[PDB]
Structure 1
């Protein structure tokens, strides 16, 4: 996982809704809503920062070579197909299809939530309570383009583009030097080039078959998305708590009591909802720290396995690491480690 869902909270909307008296009473707190919004904004900025660190390591966009004469090695499964509206690979398409986001887009209009849909739709209920979801700065198409440039550089230039000034080299000789890097002489690579290319193609096809089947293996991104959705749904659900008041509805209290008698109940509800928001923000901060650690690990792996050959054991797959290929995925990255 690389990034998590960025959220914003309208504290007045969540705590009080459309109640003017409740907002006037909540004005006596003030700074807590600002603190929660500041923490949420920091998390949202950190998500885009993590995405940029993981995927925007190189600023030099390399296109797919036309000839595609890589000494029997086949990369069409990890290379984009222009037929798709998004210039992402077939394996990237499989990864995208295996993760279901809470919302397909990011624009839910008022007319779409008008009526009973305000209750049946979870997103409508979240938005009617001041909880909004901010989109990532980089779209999936741009992340796919960054992955495309990285893959093109690592296939056409190998490791040189990671150190700047990409130098072209035939893929057979790149494989020979990578074999030399793991203690195997290059004549072994050159005398078994057909066999090695066939095994690499077979392994790529096996990964494609595994991804196309019911086996997901993408549980981390789905867990992140489900955690964010569950946190938002729990925040919505906690509005039914009385918090020691006569009722959990501000409208009932206002229609049932005068200003003095309703003041204590509204204060209790405000305190409870502020506590719920604080708990949500603290949990979001902890999950953001975990996601930042994961994204730092992903960036390090992208630097040391895709931009070069790593001698660290079990850092870029099991076995003697040869190379790695990046792929975009919903809120995450997928490394194909060739060893």
Structure 2
């Protein structure tokens, strides 16, 4: 069964790259503003130092992840003013030069589907004073020593990196990932990529308009499907927020003491009897911080594996053409385009799909004069009465000639050989 038509399909893949960076003030969480509790807590300083070392390790690893995914190339390419790409329209994934953020249309759609817990990192003391505290969750966190640190690269820098990658791929093919960028017309690059899945160039050059229309329609479908999906990127936000709020809620546990309020214990009890209750509370709250830090470490390990996978995809699907099955989408991989998303990356994989199949009878070899002829790079098929040779992935019948097959042995060994004539296109010219 040989396909007769094709389909050009664009699919999306979503990957998380980084998580929220956090820091803890140990004394602020355990004791608040009680001097006596701090003097009692001075016996456990090593544990707070150890917890902070673990958190800072996680925090620097997050920036390393983002650097490894997005900052591969250090040349910031610019897209040409003339958009003459053989009828392919990349306007939906190129940066809009009029919005404040220089983001593409699809990136703008993606950024409105993930809602960050807090926008901005400057919440002033005067902003939440009195009622607003203990009602707004961020201020409740911040009055107990729990702070969120901003990432090193802003959204605009990552958008710049993705736009540089896109301009490189559509102006220079895959050469800019191996060295200096070498310019090439876009249709000739498309013909090279068709050569790389086993389809001859003339198929692309004859069907160029159909292929361009299919690509444009697929991009339009992607756009119309996003303005209507990103759970992998929302669950990271939800998990970090939930962990911080659970730490804030666990401050109402007695742990076997008379009360959970230090000020209630410090009044009504003298130091020798207040010390044992404060000690119980201190042990419980150190355990809560330890549990939080351990689960943060395990989550950071998972995010690191995801970011390594994203870097490998960026290298092998965007900066080249991949032959490993299902790594860069479903079908024969043609090319990929990256887009930045909040805390992650989206890949647009363009692949080739065989469309309409027809049935033929086939044979391994042809027996002409006691010789066995085999196809050089095709397959032998029959429409019922006549015998042709074609290519495996597209139906393009041709007459069997000697410049088209090769001989090996006689006809006594091949199991299913058939009888037919081989043109040998020299005899007419010699005559």
> Matches of 1:314 and 1:245 in 2, distance apart?
58
> Matches of 1:232 and 1:222 in 2, distance apart?
16
Bigger drift between 246-255 and 322-331 goes to 246-255
Residue aligned with 2:43, SS: coil
Map of 2:155 onto structure 1: 140
Q: Which runs of 5+ in 1 are unaligned?
A: none
> Matches of 1:284 and 1:174 in 2, distance apart?
46
Give runs of ≥4 in structure 1 deviating > 3 Å: none
> Matches of 1:2 and 1:144 in 2, distance apart?
15
Q: Which residue, 36, 39, 42 being the options, matches 1:21?
A: 36
Residue aligned with 1:104, SS: coil
The one-character-per-residue Cα deviations of 1:2-31 (angstroms, maximum 9, x if unpaired) are 000000111111111111111111110111
1:122: how far off? 0.7
> Matches of 2:213 and 2:316 in 1, distance apart?
26
1:232: how far off? 0.6
Map of 1:261 onto structure 2: 273
Q: Which one has a larger percent strand, Structure 1 or Structure 2?
A: 2
RMSD, aligned α-carbons: 0.9
The one-character-per-residue Cα deviations of 1:132-186 (angstroms, maximum 9, x if unpaired) are 0001100000011001101111111111111121111111111111111111112
Residue aligned with 2:97, SS: coil
The one-character-per-residue Cα deviations of 1:74-120 (angstroms, maximum 9, x if unpaired) are 11111110111111111001110000000011111111111111111
Residue aligned with 2:121, SS: coil
1:71: how far off? 0.7
TM-score by length of 2: 0.77
- The structure that has the greater radius of gyration is 2
> Matches of 1:312 and 1:259 in 2, distance apart?
71
Q: Which runs of 5+ in 2 are unaligned?
A: 1-15, 352-431
> Matches of 1:147 and 1:256 in 2, distance apart?
63
> Matches of 2:197 and 2:280 in 1, distance apart?
66
1:256: how far off? 2.6
2:308 counterpart of 1:296: yes
Q: Which one has a larger percent helix, Structure 1 or Structure 2?
A: 1
> Matches of 2:84 and 2:345 in 1, distance apart?
27
